[PDB]
């Protein structure tokens, strides 16, 4: 029943890439570093249901940190503390990985680490300038498990 | 990305990125964490290089064309620089940095270990091990058609 | 590598019970309905890292609702709104299941439902009074997946 | 737990729990959702039964011993009650409730469908389908050694 589905997913971990299950950059829910953690902003962050939210500066490709909801533990809304400050009070590792990375390898990094999230980047050899890493998306442990158990 | 150290025959380099002005103290932490005494810049000035020199490491701004090979003058200045600084202080390290460290700067390091004895394929596969996708077509052409000198 | 471990877990879904992977009642993190959602209480709830927290009234065996952290979206600390009120503003289904329930069946209920959590109860035939359902613990989707991927 | 409906031969019952005073309006929603016109209580009074009667359903407090079988007087009062109310209003439903509905109350329902024709094993397996673990040893003994009357 469940068992053959989960088995098939487990085997496909070897061939599927992080690129196949990621939520692409356009659809990731994200927050800018210049956000002002006042009453309405914090409420909107909490009501989203996300436990962790990528934080960007400038363009959404420029992902600089992770805001865990717990990080807002004792923040005062009346003080309007900018988000970047809170970002600076807490350490949340920020993994990056290549579109090549198979799903079993990503799964085992997830099992080791403290971060359950990873930015998906590619490299482009096509340019009138130096090669650069292009972020494509974000893959979570939940994407990988969603792909095992369908 | 992040900085990478490359060592071959007492030569040691740090391929790195272009920092911003606020990152630059942690930057110098990392520059001294690999013991680099001089840094050579190929991108355009987005900060000021007086504190990095006040922490003891000299800054050389040698910009050339983005995505393009270095001219032969920059090549000879570069080789003479590695010679001078590596016999002034052996075992030390000199840093080079592009915008992220994925083109011009790795090309310079490439010429250094290719003049240092390591072959073309061995050097390119040595660098892209240490950071994936390091070179683009216009720079593959140069590093391929470059003539060593045993300097 | 990963694949044979996950396969073995998937097969053991049929034999293992909800009773084997639950976090027993003594160790579940829980909150009482008479909590007063003032500044410190809400902060303590957020800083715990739990997205959902069982809510009890009286003795911890008496689990009455679920507090999702998002449920605190626009609550004012200065107003000291009791927790039971917030509990009454939001509907979060409260599944109960028997210690017998195998892990594949629980997994498929989890896949269907909106609640990813379940109270684990047993029945005791031994008493000088009427039989009663005894809550033993709580099993989550994360317990089940933790048991698939080790 | 939650309430359960049991139907056999125009008989219909609702095995239920003892509510609190705040749950009791949603409770009466559920009592009318199965169309119960009378409710008989076996636990001890933890609320007041004047609103439940103001919503149209009569309350009968017949307490006997927790975990124990009903006396023969309660049995005959009970059978006469199902007779009277089910020929007063056929297809209607009468509710019985223990603390959670896992002993005395299912025993009463048990005697009703056992006097109604359904066998002993068929009735017990009929009830524990509908709520698991319904009977304990002291009540298994009664329901086993009870003599039907075709009432």
Swiss-Prot record, chains A, C:
Cellular localization per UniProt: Cell membrane
Coiled-coil regions listed: none
Tissue-by-tissue expression: Widely expressed, with highest levels in kidney, lung, spleen and testis. In the kidney, predominantly expressed in the distal convoluted tubule and, at lower levels, in the connecting tubule (at protein level).
Boundaries of every CBS domain copy: 22-83, 90-150
Domain of life the protein comes from: Eukaryota
Record's note on what induces expression: By low Mg(2+) concentration.
Post-translational modification remark: The N-terminus is cleaved within the endoplasmic reticulum. The signal peptidase complex seems to be involved in the processing, but the exact cleavage site has not been identified.
Job of this protein: Divalent metal cation transporter. Mediates transport of divalent metal cations in an order of Mg(2+) > Co(2+) > Mn(2+) > Sr(2+) > Ba(2+) > Cu(2+) > Fe(2+).
Assigned protein family: Belongs to the ACDP family.
Subunit organization: Isoform 1 and isoform 2 may interact with each other.
Note: Shares weak sequence similarity with the cyclin family, hence its name. However, it has no cyclin-like function in vivo.
The protein, known as: Metal transporter CNNM2
Species in which this protein is naturally found: Mus musculus (Mouse)
From Swiss-Prot, chains B, D:
Top-level taxonomy: Eukaryota, Metazoa, Chordata, Craniata, Vertebrata
Keywords: Cell cycle, Cell membrane, Cytoplasm, Cytoskeleton, Developmental protein, Disulfide bond, Endoplasmic reticulum, Endosome, Hydrolase, Lipoprotein, Membrane, Methylation, Nucleus, Prenylation, Protein phosphatase
Gene3D superfamilies named among the record's database cross-references: Protein tyrosine phosphatase superfamily
Active site: 66, 98
Subunit structure as annotated in this protein's UniProt entry: Homotrimer. Interacts with tubulin. Interacts with ATF5.
Organism: Mus musculus
GO biological process: positive regulation of cell migration
Subcellular location: Cell membrane; Early endosome; Endoplasmic reticulum; Cytoplasm
Membrane topology listed for this record: Lipid-anchor
Name by which UniProt lists this protein: Protein tyrosine phosphatase type IVA 1
One GO MF term attached to the UniProt entry: protein tyrosine phosphatase activity
Main EC class the enzyme belongs to: hydrolase
Domain Tyrosine-protein phosphatase positions: 2-151
CC terms in the record's Gene Ontology section: early endosome; endoplasmic reticulum; endosome; nucleus; plasma membrane; spindle
Disulfide bonds: 43-98
EC id: 3.1.3.48
Residues that, per the record, bind substrate: 104
